A = this chain, B = another copy of it.
Amino acid sequence: GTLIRVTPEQPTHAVCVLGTLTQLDICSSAPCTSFSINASPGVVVDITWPLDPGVEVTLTMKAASGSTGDQKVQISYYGPKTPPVKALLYLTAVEISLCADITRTGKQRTWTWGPCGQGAILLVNCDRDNLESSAMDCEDDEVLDSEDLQDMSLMTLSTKTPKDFFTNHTLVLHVARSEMDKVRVFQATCSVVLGPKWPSHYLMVPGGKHNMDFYVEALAFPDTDFPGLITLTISLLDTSNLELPEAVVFQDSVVFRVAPWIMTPNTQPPQEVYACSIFENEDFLKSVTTLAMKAKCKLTICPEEENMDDQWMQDEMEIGYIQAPHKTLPVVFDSPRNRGLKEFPIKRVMGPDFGYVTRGPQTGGISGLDSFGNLEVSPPVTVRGKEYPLGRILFGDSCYPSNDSRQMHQALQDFLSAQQVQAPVKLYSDWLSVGHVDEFLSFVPAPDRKGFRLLLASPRSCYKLFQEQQNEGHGEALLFEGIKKKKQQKIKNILSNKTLREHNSFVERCIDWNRELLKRELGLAESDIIDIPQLFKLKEFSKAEAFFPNMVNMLVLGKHLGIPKPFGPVINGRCCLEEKVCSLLEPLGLQCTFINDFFTYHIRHGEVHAGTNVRRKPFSFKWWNMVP
């Protein structure tokens, strides 16, 4: 919007950027009761008229000027006995368009969510296409690899002006100072034009028609301090007067939204399995290798020389992804856990088209609930009408803060909620010694109703199984048959154990609290849920550990499950636990492999899920089409 004031005293000169509203003030300097307007053919005057200020006179230019002032407007002021007094206006039209991929396919200054929304996407440039380097690509002020440009978002400035136009005008590209630390912009002929402590740049643009390409990288994920929006603006300046400051004639802009870090549920098809089972195990590792092949997965394995005896590949990292219309790449969220695997995500996982993030304090100030077996996501889910098409992040907490309670660090929680497309849900896991949601829940795919089952550990179910076995004559059957060094225990004495039953009633109650919580927060019905027979015991601080290998802590590789071998009571040549589980899951077309993790994992307080990790295929559904 511009108001040009015209004057019989003086001719007026003015620029008109196409796609802009220009109007005339014809009254303020008028000499005379009426006026007429006459303009050249490229000006459309939209509006023999009375000289009253309520008269809207609006000018539109059809196309760019070939020369300065090549369009013109004559305002004739005339009266009842006065010969006409004319006022002149000389116009110069220009095209100035800052473009970006605002329809989210392939190239209102407002970013809107949803299929009918608008606004271009920006990726955080958190991988490392630069060969033999340690740092992420967005850490320097240079484009060092041509393929790095694939991660960046294209923005273009198209101008169409007279050959002499930038004699007297200048263009400046800018970003707010509040945002300059979160973005870098490169000018393609690459050299940096905008970024940290570089909030504006004068552009060198020749007259006529020109097109200038820019490449934009984000430097920061959305977070509590950063909603995720970056605005870049082009300003046109009149630099005509040597005795005067520059004068803004026109501003236009593009708003980008930085892509959120997104997790993938056990229902997304697996692409790559990780273990760092180079340590004293080997048949464990053989078993996961067979599963990986059955599942058609790359297999990556971490040597004891790198592990540092840290076998818990689930816990230091979570492989998610970022996604823009032009580019999608996996991104490792590196837990601050910082144990033997500390170097693995930064040295072995991050790299070409493999992004990196971390959060939280890196030198301690951490808890077990920051290990990423405490970080999971549900399958897609619709809940009393609200749709969650990438699922809902699930993570474990206490039921209230006490001096004795634990939580995942606030920095991590805040980062996850600021990603806003998998709206996290706090679960209750602090009752477990280790403290992770992967100790009592899993999701697996299913061919029917909602496409998954929620699996939950279930003391109830194991008591039922064992009772049924004893009812049919097998109370002498031994739990822990098969084991080198273990006290065998008979079904009958397990059932008769009143303290064990007390402990497992308490655990049942903790698990049921989450059952109902997941029901509410995911819109699950009982028919979405399968109980896995599982016994627990309480130990130090009355905290819960698995009584026999925790079977819900499984590896889900499509229809192929890697389940800790419970070494349960052998009845008809078969562990009845294995039997029960198979009867529960095989009707969904899942294939159960029971992996001996006993001396290697189980007795160190984790199982098969805990010892492994999976990279899975990103959702087809584009995050930006959500309405969070």
Contact = CB atoms under 8 A, between A and B. Distances in A.
Interface string A228-244: 00000101000001011
Interface string A175-214: 0111000000000000000000001100000000000000
Given A3-B515, A399-B235, A177 B248 contact: no
Nearest to A509: B247
A431 interface: yes
Nearest to A235: B400
A305 interface: no
Contact of A516 (B2, B224, B520): B2
A1 B506 contact: no
Given A410-B177, A526-B53, A199 B401 contact: yes
A245 interface: yes
Copies of this chain, whole number: 2
A398 to B, nearest CB: 10
A410 B226 CA distance: 13
A436 interface: no
Interface string A496-529: 0001001100100110110110011000001000
A200 B526 contact: no
A310 B251 CA distance: 39
A5 interface: yes
B401 A176 contact: yes
B431 A177 contact: no
Given A3-B512, A460-B28, A542-B244, A401 B224 contact: no
Given A5-B460, A245-B431, A177 B502 contact: no
Contacts of A512: 3
Contacts of A235: 399-400
A174 interface: yes
B399 A248 contact: yes
A200 B402 contact: yes
Point out which of A400, A503, A515, A520 has the most chain B C-beta atoms below 10 A from its C-beta.
A400
Contacts of A199: 400-401
Interface residues of A, number: 52
A584 interface: no
A299 B1 CA distance: 43
Interface of A: prevailing SS = mixed
Contacts of A243: 499, 502
Nearest to A515: B3
B3 A244 contact: no
A132 interface: no
Contact of A178 (B410, B510, B526): B410
Interface in A379-406: 399-402
B177 A1 contact: no
Contacts of A251: 399
A400 B233 contact: yes
Given A3-B512, A224-B225, A506 B241 contact: yes
A235 B405 CA distance: 15
A245 B542 contact: yes
Contact of A200 (B174, B401, B502, B542): B401
Contacts of A400: 172, 174, 199-200, 233, 235, 248
Nearest to A9: B467
A407 interface: yes
B244 A513 contact: no
A502 B5 contact: no
A245 B392 CA distance: 29
A149 to B, nearest CB: 26
A519 B200 contact: no
Contacts of A460: 5, 28-29
Contacts of A515: 3
Nearest to A531: B28
B401 A177 contact: yes
Contacts of A178: 410, 413-414
Nearest to A234: B400
A245 B53 contact: no
A224 B226 CA distance: 9
B224 A506 contact: no
Interface in A283-337: none
A129 to B, nearest CB: 31
Given A241-B502, A399-B235, A248 B513 contact: yes
Contacts of A428: 248
A506 B247 contact: yes
A244 B506 contact: yes
Ranked 10 nearest A-B pairs via Cβ: A199-B401, A174-B400, A248-B399, A1-B516, A244-B506, A245-B542, A177-B401, A247-B509, A178-B410, A235-B400
Given A28-B460, A233-B400, 5 more contacts: A3-B515, A224-B225, A244-B506, A245-B542, A247-B509
17 contacts: A5-B460, A28-B464, A29-B460, A29-B464, A174-B401, A176-B401, A177-B401, A178-B413, A199-B401, A233-B400, A241-B506, A243-B502, A245-B506, A245-B542, A247-B506, A247-B510, A248-B428
Interface of A: 1-3, 5, 28-29, 53, 172, 174, 176-178, 199-200, 224-225, 233, 235, 241, 243-245, 247-248, 251, 399-402, 407, 410, 413-414, 428, 431, 460, 464, 499, 502-503, 506, 509-510, 512-513, 515-516, 519-520, 526, 538, 542
